[PDB]
Assembly symmetry: D2
Homo-oligomer: 224 residues x 4
Amino acid sequence: HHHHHHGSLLPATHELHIFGSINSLEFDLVGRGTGNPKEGYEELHLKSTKSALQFSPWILVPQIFYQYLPFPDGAMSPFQAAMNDGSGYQVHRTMQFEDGATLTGIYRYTYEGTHIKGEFQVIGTGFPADGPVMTNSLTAADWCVTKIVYPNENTIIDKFDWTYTTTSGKRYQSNVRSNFTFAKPIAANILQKQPMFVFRKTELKHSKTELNFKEWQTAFSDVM
Amino acid sequence: SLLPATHELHIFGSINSLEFDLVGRGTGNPKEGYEELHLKSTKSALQFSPWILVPQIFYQYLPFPDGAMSPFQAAMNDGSGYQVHRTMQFEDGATLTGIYRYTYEGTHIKGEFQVIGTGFPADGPVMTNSLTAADWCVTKIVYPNENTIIDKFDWTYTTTSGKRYQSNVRSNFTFAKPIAANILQKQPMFVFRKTELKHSKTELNFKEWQTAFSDVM
Amino acid sequence: SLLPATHELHIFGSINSLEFDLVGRGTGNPKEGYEELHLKSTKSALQFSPWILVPQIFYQYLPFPDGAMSPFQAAMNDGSGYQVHRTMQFEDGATLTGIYRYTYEGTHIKGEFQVIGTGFPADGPVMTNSLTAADWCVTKIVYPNENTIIDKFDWTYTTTSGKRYQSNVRSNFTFAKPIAANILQKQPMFVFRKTELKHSKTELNFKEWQTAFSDVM
Amino acid sequence: SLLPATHELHIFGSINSLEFDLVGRGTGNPKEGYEELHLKSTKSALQFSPWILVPQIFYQYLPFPDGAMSPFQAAMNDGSGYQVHRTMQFEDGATLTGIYRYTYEGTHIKGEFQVIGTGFPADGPVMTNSLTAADWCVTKIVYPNENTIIDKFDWTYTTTSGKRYQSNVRSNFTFAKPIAANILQKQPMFVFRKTELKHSKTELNFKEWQTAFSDVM
């Protein structure tokens, strides 16, 4: 899109400001990343602007860019099409954990050419003081299949069952739904591609002040 | 014991990305669980049912039984306060989150409430302004630890079509100071609430009656 | 107006594939909302908390306010009856389904309840016999149509560890004949219930009190 | 070494209290995740969409990647077996519970599946036979302990109106003997399934293809 950029306008770089609180404990992180929007790969570095995180940095995954996700056959995903034409979308995600904790993420983006700027507000509450989030006991996130559905032409809901492994070997579960609101209607040729799934893998290296994150995503309508 | 007499609210956010922003003042009786609030839009008319802001639009006015302070009142009394994070999941897949923060000046409360609602169908009763009232409701309160309250309720509106419009609601309250042992010992606690809302396109006049109970037998 | 005075129950099924089967009789007071029931296992010791069978173990004892019949009593009264399909979804992922069917012999009720539960952790409070009591509870009754009711409640037990053990419960009632209009219009309706269970591994002695209410103010 | 070649099903229960009973026979290919089944009503015409019996109507035909026995196959191979308790919660409030029990005789499976469904609106697509197909589906499998599998999937039908009809499904499997440790170390496991159904009101002809996968990349 754009008189001096004739191809699709897909992301090459991003930056994130993520902030909010977990059990009223305030956090704020900023950082920059890159990725490959033809392969569904992204990576991001973050650093606290407020000293050490008093909870598992893994509770920020998957809060920490579907603009890097292509659809099959080199097609644009609806996320990519909304960045391509400047119209955009918003996200409102809610995670509901097996221990009654809730985590809401509110994601907003602006775009400058192939660079994305994210402002994500995240609020989590009701994490038990001896549970794995507050004791920093999460070790990894399981690989995950999300299903994409379209309640109308301007909305997507994605849905997934999200599980971490913990230092004890036990899993820690939540139900996640993400409501996407698009400023412009999603193209009919995307809407007809149902059902659609996305396989995702994440990695995270962290200290108490810094995060180094990676995600691979692959959309698929079949395996067989 | 310093209980509230007056309040003000700045409530803002969006419903299906449509932004709103309202400000106003109210009063209430913390010995009887009554409050009333007027709000006015700082933009234009709301582009959705004003009823979707109920019960977003002050447990500081709720006494506990036999004249005791509720934990919400105790937290105001000593200034330590609490936060609210509320999530409503509707039958049609919509989600509404409310994030409530307060400051206190003597017997005056100032509320800053952020509300984000998404996934309301364009032909549903929220977006077509077809909600007519909110059913009276019983909330259940438990205390999972000395700093945390979880309340839960099934929230239903009546609509012009006669079909009720339902959501399941959970509210997580986070307290800066521990809640009194003697409060913690009485679980669960229930609260019976009635609401009223009169509105124009730009102004809302809201009332709420709330009464806590352990038993009705 | 032929209200219940006695009942009997055969309740059977399995918990995590462990079969159980109990039988026994009871009495109650359908003007007071009281019932008691004594059950004995027909398959020796229960291999799980007997409290997981509460509230599986008779809304025909529930009057509505001012001496009115509840819809459940009315359906006994005229013989037409109703069926129940209840699902409880627990915080630890376990699911318990109950299927309740009744026949009537004058003022006597005969129940056949099938109950299947799975997914209870081996180290959770049901399988370790660590439930200590069931919290008092308010249920909400709604009517999707003239021959169905849905009831909903947040069910919690206390346990020996101090941590409550929670589930969301929904009960779908299917009535053979339409529920009277004068009942349908009393919405919303709530019921306050209290239960007691004294037990061994083979014998359960249960009591329940229930009181319908439209308001508390 | 022993995998199924044939199966028979007796599936029975009720939808909105309307009783149904079907019986029939099928085959499949357990090296490839394929099965087909024919069913005929033993009572009258089905009083609701036959598609609501999909996926009630055999993971013993599912291999795991690389010519592995699934744990479902291993349990048939050694005769120890497993039971299934499935709950579907639909977007309109309906609930459908399935309870599946099997016996084996050589390479033949005999299933006895009890299905109870309630809460389907009179005007909804199940009761108006408005379901047209089931979307292709990915299920997630996890193993909470060595005797239990939980599977989970979002199940959607297409309908004559064009609006999909959605439910959240969970299935709890209880195994009589422990699942092998090598199987337990690989989770989550996913399964891609495709179904077909041709039907009248009295007869169903069903096909399913299933492929387990740990990755797609």
